[PDB]
């Protein structure tokens, strides 16, 4: 957790921004290609410049990093708005992540991130174009041993910003279930020492 958090946050930011841009979740005019977005990105990743969207993405990534000790799968679901049905699912496996109980040069980490993001972009390019006008996205995680929404039964008298952040992050999730022609396409992840991440995608 020394340098793992920063690289993981950068990778999550690149992943979310690429998925938003290439699936037309937000207008392409609001995205710009850049390498610095308060962190040196491994590539020229198109990052949205809407302040509310940036804050939302950063908060979600921080929450996921906080809960990383108990979550083994992070998914961004693409759901239509005419009906609440998921049409595309991108799964980011976290099978123990090779957690650093006790850390490697940044160059190889960025090279592996470049390979994984290039695989993701190559998969996304061949997908059919998605129309504008109310296509939206959704975030779902798969947990091992946790229970959220139950930390507000003691009146949670906050004292500092850390306690308020913990309370708001515990209460910002709801319980969901596991739920044809589902097509599974495995992608390229990172095989570096500290970070062992597997990438998946779903269609239909």
């Amino acid at each position: 957790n020394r340098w793992v958090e920063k690289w993981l946050r950068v990778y999550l930011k690149c992943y979310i921004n690429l998925i938003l841009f290439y699936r037309n979740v937000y207008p392409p005019q609001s995205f710009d290609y850049t390498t610095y977005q308060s962190f040196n990105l491994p590539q020229f990743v198109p990052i949205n410049r809407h302040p509310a969207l940036i804050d939302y993405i950063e908060e979600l990534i921080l929450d996921v990093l906080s809960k990383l000790t108990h979550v083994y799968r992070f998914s961004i679901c693409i759901i239509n708005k005419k009906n609440d049905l998921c049409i595309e699912k991108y799964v980011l496996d976290f099978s123990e992540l090779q957690h650093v109980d006790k850390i490697i040069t940044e160059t190889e980490v960025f090279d592996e991130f470049r390979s994984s993001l290039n695989s993701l972009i190559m998969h996304l390019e061949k997908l059919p174009k998605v129309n504008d006008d109310t296509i939206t996205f959704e975030a779902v995680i798969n947990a091992i041993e946790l229970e959220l929404g139950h930390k507000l039964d003691r009146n949670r008298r906050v004292d500092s910003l850390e306690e308020k952040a913990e309370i708001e992050r515990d209460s910002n999730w709801v319980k969901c279930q596991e739920d044809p022609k589902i097509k599974l396409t495995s992608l390229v992840g990172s095989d570096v020492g500290p970070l062992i991440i597997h990438q998946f995608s779903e269609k239909l």
């Binding site: 290609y33 590539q43 020229f44 390979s115 290039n118 972009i121 190559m122």
Partner: protein, 117 residues
């Protein structure tokens, strides 16, 4: 060699998704630019399963270098002095990456001075 180069290009194009340049062949096989361009052209053939985008550039007269985009209407075809394949792009946006390269023995032109330590 048409075998090591093809294997390296296939690896760098499919195993680790990254655009491959002819300069990559120059640095890997320790060959001159002309041999690298010929090997790239050879790999362009025998490609019944085409799963990449070719980035081709041509050299005009008056020392002008252009990147072909339209691929249908190339202006001033009579003034072309050279045309080759610059890279194989597995994605749509080229956007390559550049790193530190040790040109110990792959240099075709060297400056008159030598690095003194």
């Amino acid at each position: 060699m048409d075998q090591k180069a093809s294997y390296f290009i296939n690896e760098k194009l499919f195993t680790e998704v990254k655009p491959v340049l002819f300069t990559d062949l120059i640095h890997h096989l320790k060959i001159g630019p002309s041999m690298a361009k010929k090997l790239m052209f050879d790999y362009y053939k025998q490609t019944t399963n085409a799963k990449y985008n070719c980035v081709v550039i041509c050299c005009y007269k008056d020392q002008t270098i252009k990147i072909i985009h339209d691929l249908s209407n190339i202006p001033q075809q009579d003034s072309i002095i050279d045309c080759f394949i610059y890279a194989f792009n597995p994605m749509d946006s080229f956007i390559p990456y550049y790193d530190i390269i040790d040109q110990k023995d792959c240099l075709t032109i060297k400056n008159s001075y030598e690095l003194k330590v």
